[PDB]
Amino acid sequence: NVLQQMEHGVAQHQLGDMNVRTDGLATVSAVLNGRKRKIANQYMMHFDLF
Amino acid sequence: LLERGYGNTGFTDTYSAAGIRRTNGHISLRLSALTDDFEFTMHPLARAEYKETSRVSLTSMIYVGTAGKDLSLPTGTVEDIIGAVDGMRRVVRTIGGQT
Amino acid sequence: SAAYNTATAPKVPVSRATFFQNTKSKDFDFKFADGADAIANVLQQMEHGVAQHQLGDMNVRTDGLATVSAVLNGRKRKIANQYMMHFDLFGRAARSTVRMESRIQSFGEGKDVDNFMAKFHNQLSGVYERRSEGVANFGRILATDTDLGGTSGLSVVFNGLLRGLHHVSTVPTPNVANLPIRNNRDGAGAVVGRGDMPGREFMDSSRILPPRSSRWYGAPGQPIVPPAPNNPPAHVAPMETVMAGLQKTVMNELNRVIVSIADVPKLPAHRIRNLIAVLAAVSKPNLGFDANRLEDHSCFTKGWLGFNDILLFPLTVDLFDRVVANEAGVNDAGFIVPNAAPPQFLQNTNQQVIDFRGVGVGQAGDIPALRLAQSWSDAIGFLLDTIGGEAQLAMGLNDMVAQCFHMHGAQTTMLSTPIISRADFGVYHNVVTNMYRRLAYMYTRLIRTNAAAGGGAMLDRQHYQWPTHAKVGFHDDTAVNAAAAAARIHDGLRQPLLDEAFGAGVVQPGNMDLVGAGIDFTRDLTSSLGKAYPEHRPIGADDNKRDLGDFTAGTVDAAASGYEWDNYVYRLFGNMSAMRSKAEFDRLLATFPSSTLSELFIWMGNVGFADTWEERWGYDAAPLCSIPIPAGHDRSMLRNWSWVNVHNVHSVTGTSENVVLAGYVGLSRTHDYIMDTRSTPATSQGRRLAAMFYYTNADKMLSLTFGLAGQLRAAADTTVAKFQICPHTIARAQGYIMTDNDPLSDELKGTDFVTEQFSLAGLTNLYLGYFDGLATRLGIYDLRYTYSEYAECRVELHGIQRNFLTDRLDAFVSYKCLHPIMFEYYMCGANISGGILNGDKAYEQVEMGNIRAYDAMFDTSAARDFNFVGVRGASQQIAAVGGFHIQYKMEVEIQRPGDGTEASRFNVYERYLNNYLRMSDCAPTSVLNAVSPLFWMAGTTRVVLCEAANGYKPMAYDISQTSFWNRENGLWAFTWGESEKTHRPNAIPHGTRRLGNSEVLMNSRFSKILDKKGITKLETRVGGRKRGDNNDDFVAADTRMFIIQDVAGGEHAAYSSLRDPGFALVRAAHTWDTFVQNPRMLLLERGYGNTGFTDTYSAAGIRRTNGHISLRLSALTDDFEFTMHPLARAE
Amino acid sequence: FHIQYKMEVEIQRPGDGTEASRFNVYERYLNNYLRMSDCAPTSVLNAVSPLFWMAGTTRVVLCEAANGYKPMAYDISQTSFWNRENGLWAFTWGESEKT
Amino acid sequence: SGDNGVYSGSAAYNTATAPKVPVSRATFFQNTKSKDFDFKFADGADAIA
Amino acid sequence: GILNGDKAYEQVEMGNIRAYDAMFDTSAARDFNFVGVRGASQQIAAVGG
Amino acid sequence: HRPNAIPHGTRRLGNSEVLMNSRFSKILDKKGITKLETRVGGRKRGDNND
Amino acid sequence: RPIGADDNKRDLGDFTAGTVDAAASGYEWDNYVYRLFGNMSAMRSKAEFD
């Protein structure tokens, strides 16, 4: 499974993000894209590096 | 910031059902600006596996109006356009031997 | 059914052919070439022996607004008629992006990495040093990782190589001023020494094609590294160092894109160095180009996000020695290479790095190899003959054309939309209000005249060159003493005019003594606005009164000064009654051609002028009279419609796009080479396609793609008409209620108008499915339907982001772009709506008793090609020939389902049904091309067209009399001429061909109508009083001017100021509806002067308008047919 | 309060190509409020609606007017007659514990 | 509810899908007729009956 | 999660019902809950402020 | 554009390139984003006097 | 962020103010908090400030 999962990750292009080089608040982002009205939103999860 | 409240309007604290109806525009209109057909096209740790599930198009242009005729094209208009395109005999069928 | 009907007689059955001309030749059948392969199709169209669009039918190389033309030849009276088709080259409305991902995956579950690493570093030992950490690192990547979906992402690379080819070819000249290259600006926008972007250089042959360590400094046989003052640049590293830096990035992608070349095509070495400059720049965002129009990006350059930098990886030494090969300096027979130039080497490299940079605008660099359209087509052939991408160039063409080609929509070019919906709201949102203020100001100032040698002393007479406004003026121009009570215009309309414009009396009528000497009209006929005036073109006492005359009133030789522009706009709107209110003024401006609105925006904004209008006219009030046009927008950009609404600019496909498809990395091609060097990736069909791109010019490629843009836009026009795609239909799919009538939306609020059984998910699959079915039948093979299915590619329709407030009244205008005749051009005579009227039938002489509407005489139930809105549109064009308007009421009976409220009728689409027709900008020459708005109505509503009460009324002005004077700018007013000696100035702005004898034969036929019904007369008569020289007395001035007419053509002295009978009406208490005009102005208004005529119905009116419709239409018509052809393929 | 209704007579002219004519009938009673009947001058329940006395052989379409809910002129509940021998009639009062 | 020409649409709970109340005459109007007894009209043979 | 715009559930009106959530019947749904409607209706109200 | 930032993401998805709620703030006037207005708000002390 | 005379009143100004360029000093921080809770009716008591 790890071999399969190593082909992916949170960081893609204009779809996901990773801010881990921080002073203690690493986040992982993801853009939710709307088809009917072209409304987009961004969601985060915050990790405690302390 | 800006505190919000009732001002020079006969509004009071009410119940949820009567207060949602009372604030009609500030909910129905905003929901149209805020909501959408939101969808996730990506997943970390997994790959999109496509499925053939009969993608749906709308069967008919639902016309409204109780009196009059609609603005649809005359029934022999697109038929004459297809016949003209067929005359040019350019229909593409293969891409490097592959259909 | 609760409605009482009235008995009536059967009506005359009519079909489309009764009213509209079939523009298909029955004598000349153009034949077509077979073929069902798409790669073969590219080869057939690219043969030098065929042409899709002739070079005289393409104004492609313009700063915006590329037009492509066609000619309709009448085969009976031999008169022609030119039709255009406008494309955009601005990036304001592109909305499509393309990106390529270099994602690599793992492969070969068991393949022993260490034994491939042995093959790699032994096979490549003759080029790269075998025992190095770069050959071991890059042989470690090839042994473990392959690329995900390679050689199918060559569509994107060929997409961007064609984008750059068109970018450098649709520009007026490939200069450094027209084609900037992005430099590296610091703070305050200064370059950083070479202007080359730091991490990824593309002005040097070192990031792409790094040197060889065997040829670098310090290698055995090569010189030692030079000292500090001339050391090699820091960013140049040998290839084996670059391979040591390849790695898999965070996005599972490779660091670079490896394009490994085994053997090289035998191009002249100077052409290898040029296409390498191109290959380095295609990776960068926007192709490495800068913003070259309106401080924005081009139509082709915008939306190119780029990919990782290509790495030219020579598997042999024949590309390393091909770049540095020198072929110039030899002029022997059998040895000379044409255009060959010596290599340009980056200094302090061991003659191993080629330098592409040249001088630029300031301190910025400029790669001259990027401004050559040959180097972008050379790079396409180079990649095909080295990498097999033949099947992906055919996809690259069709994807580039759909993404990078945009039309202008009916609102700009055919329909009479106001500036609110025609122009950009972020800039031109107060241009009608401020232009009304300017005119209201100038019309109420007494423009005094300088006294006799009295410094600062003025006379109350208004100056001669500024004719007095008939309604809100001060006095009679042709008066001995302007102080006489008899020669004083009633001041009943003056103050309310300024209150309407400014408000509550903040501006009052006064004096302007700033131009009392006179206007300096220019002799520069290119930039002259004074050439249009009848009074500036006098004729002799014996000369024909129809003569155009000679422009004999220029004074200076500079360009048109500011005051000359003020005079033209002063006289243009002087006689127009649409100054009673701002609401009526905006309706006037709605009927002006877009090519004239561009000249009003130059004036409204002071684009090129030395001094502003306020400085010229001494305006000192609080409200503003000008608008802030952006910095980038020039006079030449405004004339190319940089002011249009970015929502009226429709892509050729009716869809947008955002494609992200994983692409070429080159690990699969280089791995297969090390396994077996005796194969090729390029097939013999890809080597043939590669050969043609070597042997091609921009002209041949431009017509190939500007023909596809026409073909796809005609297939989208068919799909738009089929599915009624309009802003109302798209908004209904998004869940809104868009309707030009606000009370119609309040009544539709709670009903089942908006359903889940009508959404964008289905409306897009209908559009894409039906469009990509036509596109195949036309042999185009577009991938809109394919890319719609992909997870990361989004395909959406056109109006997903429209402004509901501004474009509300445009809700029912369908998205068809091209003229009803340009559809017949492309679709072999087929048509959707209806174009040119007919002369073969007497549909205007049919008369029936007690039928009140004209189009109620005709019965279209049995017609298969004709509709109830096709006769209403035909009648609107029939009446417009005579200069008349038929007001149609359109109505939606909305009864809420299940609600007991009264069934209500709502007048819909009253922006266009209430305003007069407009000379379309596609074909501005003949009236027959003025197309009715009823043909661009769509929507999901059932309407009831019916004649309005007394709907037959005269137009504001006769559009058959207005004509453009020249191709360069939009000088437009009433035109005359067309005598035995001269010709009428009727020109097509942005036209492609010069108007021939068959274009001036149309003007000649139209000017020789019975009773001079085809012309506007001119007469020479006193029309002012020039101040006598060396005194303060005004001697009468003899002026050539127009003659004001009626509906019926009568010419009475009471219709005119400058005549005693006609000025008597103005001196009394008059209104804005009085029929008194100043003939010294460039637009004349129509009316029922001294005739018994009133507003009748269409049927009775068309009978009353006997000669002006029947005779005019006979002179404007032949049996037109298309003897040209846009669809040419070789066998 | 008062609910305003409309009876609409529509005349079609499709063979003339001009707009149809819509006419209002019975407007004398649909535009004027209900009345305390003389048959029973005691309760509001006895005030009869004019729609029940609509007759005729013509084809009308009955539908409620837009924003037709408006208060009456005076509240007919409060009016009553003082005498059986004449027509004294005004706002009345007095139903107390003793009167 | 305009808000700049932005009219939303009731997608599933509109006037077409509204639950109407089944109504009879007796729902609105009073039946002034006793169920305890009936009034039999005088139906004889001749008018004097 | 987030709300929807597919339906006009904010336009549903009923007589004598005081609570907004009491307008809806979740009993047939095996998917949804009673705190789901109340939690949704708090997000519906928060849209309007 | 409206300043709709993501207070801990990167110079990426929403903070740089995508627009979040591009439609609520855009197409709505009386029931959308609050309005701004230029009028006399305060008094600035005149220079060289009181 | 002042605006023009005939600009779109629902615009975003260009931030004409600002005199120093070093860093937001203490007084500028105080002003931001001064205006943030300026017209909050939750300052009546500490409980509703919580």
Author numbering:
A (entry chain A): 51 to 100
B (entry chain A): 1093 to 1191
C (entry chain B): 11 to 1141
D (entry chain A): 894 to 992
E (entry chain A): 2 to 50
F (entry chain A): 845 to 893
G (entry chain A): 993 to 1042
H (entry chain A): 547 to 596
Question: What does the study report here?
Answer:
RnMBV1 is a potential viro-control approach agent for restraining and controlling the white root rot disease, because the virus can confer hypovirulence to its host fungus. RnMBV1 is an approximately 52 nm bipartite dsRNA mycovirus composed of dsRNA-1 (8.9 kbp in length, AB512282) and dsRNA-2 (7.2 kbp in length, AB512283). The RnMBV1 capsid is composed of 120 chemically identical MCP subunits and additional surface CrPs.
Finally, both maps were generated at an overall resolution of 3.2 Å using the “gold-standard” Fourier shell correlation (FSC) = 0.143 criterion. In each MCP_B of the RnMBV1 capsid, there is an extra-long 111-amino-acid-residue (Leu1126–Val1236) C-terminal arm/loop, which goes across, interacts, and interlocks with three adjacent subunits in the order of MCP_B1 to A2, A1, B0, whereas that of MCP_A (Leu1126–Lys1193) interacts with only one adjacent subunit. Each full protrusion domain in the RnMBV1 MCP is composed of two fragments of the amino acid residues Ala433–Leu648 and Met965–Ala1125, which form 7 β-strands (Sp-A-G) and 13 α-helices (Hp-A-M). The protrusion domains of MCP_A subunits form dimers on the capsid surface (green rectangle in Fig 3C), while those of MCP_B subunits cluster to build a trimer around each 3-fold axis (yellow triangle in Fig 3C).
